[PDB]
Structures are given as C-alpha cells and as structure tokens.
RNA sequence: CCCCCCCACCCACAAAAACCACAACACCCACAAACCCAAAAAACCCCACAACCCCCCCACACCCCACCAACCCCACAAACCCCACACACCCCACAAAAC
C-alpha cells in the first residue's frame, strides 16, 4: 500500500513475488497459491492509511526485531514501519557515516541560516534517538506520534544538502531521492557542490 | 522503481585440476611408371557469296507551337490568430509520505 507512485508496476509485482515465495515455503505453508497477494493489494491499496492496521504492523516489527523467531520472515511486510517518516534523520546519520565525520563536525559545514531551525528540530532532547530498540524506531506507526519533525520535509534544507552532496559523490540513493522543492534547492545545490568537492 | 533477521564471491566434500597421456606415431603427403586437366593430320580473326555498308531519306515539311478572348490552380460582399462566455491557467496539491 505504501509503495504507490508513477512507474512502479513491475517493481510492485517483483516484491510481491518475493513476498509470496517467502510465505509459500517453509517455515510457512502455501495457503493462497499465487497472484492472490497482488489482487488483494489492488482492492487494498490504501490500507496503509488505516490507523489500526499501521499500529499492528509496527507492533509486529518491534517484536520481531528484538526477538529472533522462526517466522521472523514476517518482518518483510513490516520493515517499512521502522524509522517511518524519519528519512531526514536517517539521511543525516548515513551522511555522517559515508562522509566519515563525527556528526558534530558535519553540522559545522552547514553554512546557512536556514539550517538552524532544522538542526534544532531534529536534535530535540528527551526523544530516544539514542536507544537501540526503543519505541522511537516505530513511533510514527504506533500511536505516540504527530507529524514527524524528522521527515524529509521537516528538515528540508538538511535533506537537500545531504543528497546533493550524495549526488556529487554518485550515491544512487541520493540520485533517486525526491528533492524538497520548497527548501531553497538551488542554494542547497551550490553548498552541496562545494562540500562534495571537498569530500569526493 | 531501499530494506526479514543472520548475512552477504550466482566460493568451496576428499583428492585434485592442460577439455594432456595405451602403445606405435604424427605433412586433413604418397601405388608404380610417370609426372601441362598439350599434342592425328591440315589448320588457326567465334573474317569473308556478291552488291553493299548511317538500325539515312516519298514529298511538303520540321517548337510532341498556335481558334480566338486570354493568361495567379486571384477575387461576391464583409472579413482575415485554425483568438477569446465567465472564471481562470503546473496535464500541482486529502493526509501521511517521498533509495
């Protein structure tokens, strides 16, 4: 339900086939034969919006991440729930690791007034951004949430800068990420150009 | 058109690796005599009856020119963006998102 968009048909079928083969082979047994999953998805495309359905998926993913299980393969549906709507924060942490910076040092390179609000927004204390298996990883899926201050839009300038540097270094993930048009992409690209020059 | 965890060469038993090896061998050489897919002789332009030798010609003629009026595959007028009701005007937008 989440993976809806332009030109994603062959790809939805491929993930669905991977899903079906997982659940048709041991420790799971084939109960729906083939192509049933795609057809139910056609009628169940907006099931992601349903709050209880999202809540349960997140709960399942939290349980399977901490405890290893025979049916741990169920996580393949619920993996999307982890770090949901926190792409900004996820992009930042990868950027720190790919660039080989201490995160603090990385923020020093953000030479613009606009980054200030975003830096405060994503680094607010008291949220378990520092705990390995906390409710935070599934916070959006679970009830304890609001619009995420960690989403690529909430931290639009930082997100743009990160992937613009990623594009300069040829990171495919950044090449295919969708740019936040509101948050001054042109200025972000210029700064990203210099930073990538330094890091490539 | 990112992700199940662990993981992460479409790496892996042993013994081993020239898609080497019986021996005899090793021109996908060879029967000899011979070794031009030469030769009877006479011949030797796929020359020649002769007249002839433009696939030239009746004459008048000789633009596959011509009735004249003519002669843009111009034209009624009004016209003349294959322009317009307003409202408008990203083939943008629920939210959440957004490898």
């Amino acid at each position: 339900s989440k993976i809806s968009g332009q030109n994603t048909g062959n790809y939805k079928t491929n993930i669905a086939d991977r899903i079906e083969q997982i659940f048709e082979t041991a420790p799971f047994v084939k109960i729906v034969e083939h192509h049933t999953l795609m057809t139910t998805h056609k009628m169940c495309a907006n099931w992601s919006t349903i709050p209880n359905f999202r809540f349960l998926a997140g709960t399942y993913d939290m349980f399977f991440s901490r405890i290893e299980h025979l049916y741990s393969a169920i996580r393949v549906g619920t993996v999307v729930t982890a770090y949901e709507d926190c792409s900004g924060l996820v992009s930042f942490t990868g950027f720190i690791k790919q660039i080989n910076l201490t995160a603090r040092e990385a923020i020093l390179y953000f030479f613009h007034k606009n980054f200030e609000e975003e830096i405060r927004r994503m680094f607010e204390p008291g949220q378990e951004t520092a705990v390995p298996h906390s409710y935070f990883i599934h916070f959006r899926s679970l009830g304890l949430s609001g619009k995420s201050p960690y989403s690529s839009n909430a931290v639009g300038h930082v997100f743009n800068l990160i992937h613009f540097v990623g594009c300069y270094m040829g990171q495919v993930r950044s090449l295919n990420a969708t740019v936040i048009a509101a948050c001054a992409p042109h200025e972000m690209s210029v700064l990203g150009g210099y930073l990538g020059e330094e890091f490539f």
Side-chain angles (χ1 to χ4, degrees):
Chain A
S1 185
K2 284 198 67 68
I3 47 180
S4 298
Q6 321 180 4
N7 322 298
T8 182
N10 178 29
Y11 314 98
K12 277 185 298 186
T13 73
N14 198 14
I15 57 79
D17 292 354
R18 186 199 316 174
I19 281 300
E20 177 57 57
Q21 62 92 10
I22 298 183
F23 299 118
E24 98 163 0
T25 287
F28 308 100
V29 280
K30 178 166 54 180
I31 57 182
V32 289
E33 207 55 43
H34 292 83
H35 302 285
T36 50
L37 185 59
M38 181 52 61
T39 59
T40 61
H41 156 71
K42 290 306 208 311
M43 276 65 180
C44 303
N46 293 2
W47 269 45
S48 60
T49 198
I50 305 176
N52 305 357
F53 188 41
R54 173 187 257 256
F55 187 104
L56 299 185
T59 310
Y60 266 102
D61 199 16
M62 199 169 170
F63 163 79
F64 279 121
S65 304
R66 174 48 72 183
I67 325 305
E68 181 59 37
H69 205 251
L70 281 293
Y71 308 116
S72 65
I74 290 182
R75 264 196 58 176
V76 61
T78 71
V79 77
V80 280
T81 71
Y83 293 113
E84 211 158 26
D85 309 346
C86 300
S87 282
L89 170 78
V90 168
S91 297
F92 189 51
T93 57
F95 165 71
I96 295 154
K97 295 179 298 182
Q98 308 229 35
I99 208 74
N100 193 52
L101 276 181
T102 181
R104 325 161 322 171
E105 278 280 340
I107 302 204
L108 299 177
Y109 289 89
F110 293 8
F111 314 125
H112 203 257
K113 186 163 299 181
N114 296 352
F115 293 120
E116 298 178 304
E117 294 188 354
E118 305 187 342
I119 286 304
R120 291 178 37 89
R121 195 171 303 168
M122 59 179 303
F123 280 115
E124 177 92 7
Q127 279 73 231
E128 278 180 341
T129 323
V131 154
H133 276 72
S134 61
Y135 280 124
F136 177 82
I137 61 187
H138 298 111
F139 98 88
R140 277 297 289 108
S141 66
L142 299 181
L144 322 173
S145 57
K147 209 228 288 187
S148 183
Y150 305 97
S151 60
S152 51
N153 311 257
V155 73
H157 294 92
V158 170
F159 187 88
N160 288 354
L161 182 68
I162 283 159
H163 296 310
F164 272 128
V165 170
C167 291
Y168 191 106
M169 304 186 314
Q171 297 298 99
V172 194
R173 182 273 155 100
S174 312
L175 270 294
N176 301 320
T178 81
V179 53
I180 308 306
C183 299
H186 299 261
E187 283 203 18
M188 296 309 111
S189 66
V190 180
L191 179 62
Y194 276 94
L195 276 148
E197 173 202 43
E198 174 56 53
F199 288 114
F200 176 87

